[PDB]
């Protein structure tokens, strides 16, 4: 998987604690994870990794001038051809074409 | 404490601590292993 399973160290209890995490701690970190994920959803984050490019450095598409949510902040500078192609990708991801495999949809994906 | 240093159950036999030290850096300097390539002490 790409994303992080956890945020922070969710298994901190004393040694030989016979579970990965306690209820208390896991609830704290569930809170923090919740906040981060909710932030991702509402700000409408989009990331991309393109072939024949450094992968660890991911173009943030949610900041691109066309797809940018804010009306104010200066978004990002990405190549004109590449950015056109990214816009087309994000756009044609949205809806289910029959014969293609059903993939989860959301409001915040648009 | 899953996040923290490993502790021994008991101490270590000091005698063994001194036996494992035979080839240590000080003994080597005394044997003359390292080449003297510079002026050193005056």
């Amino acid at each position: 998987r790409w994303a992080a399973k956890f945020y922070g160290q969710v298994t901190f209890g004393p040694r030989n604690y016979p579970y990965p995490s306690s209820r208390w701690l896991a609830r704290r970190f569930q809170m923090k994870k919740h906040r981060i994920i909710k932030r991702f959803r509402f700000r409408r984050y989009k990331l991309a990794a393109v072939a024949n490019l450094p992968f660890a450095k991911m173009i943030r598409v949610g900041m691109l001038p066309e797809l940018k949510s804010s009306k104010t902040k200066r978004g990002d500078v990405v190549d004109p051809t590449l950015s056109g192609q990214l816009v087309s990708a994000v756009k044609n991801t949205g809806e289910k074409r029959k014969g293609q495999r059903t993939r989860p949809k959301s409001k915040y994906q648009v | 404490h899953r996040s923290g240093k490993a502790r021994a159950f008991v101490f270590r036999d000091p005698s063994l601590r001194m036996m494992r030290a035979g080839s240590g850096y000080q003994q080597l300097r005394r044997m003359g292993m390292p080449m003297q390539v510079g002026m050193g002490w005056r």
């Binding site: 004393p14 030989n16 604690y17 704290r28 923090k32 | 502790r7 159950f9």
Partner: peptide, 24 residues
């Protein structure tokens, strides 16, 4: 996370497995 303990909770129990983990 909150950097302090919001609850004052002291369990007095000392299970032998928690303490000496070298042997259990």
């Amino acid at each position: 996370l909150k950097t302090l303990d919001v609850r004052e909770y002291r369990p007095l129990a000392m299970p032998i497995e928690f303490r000496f983990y070298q042997r259990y």
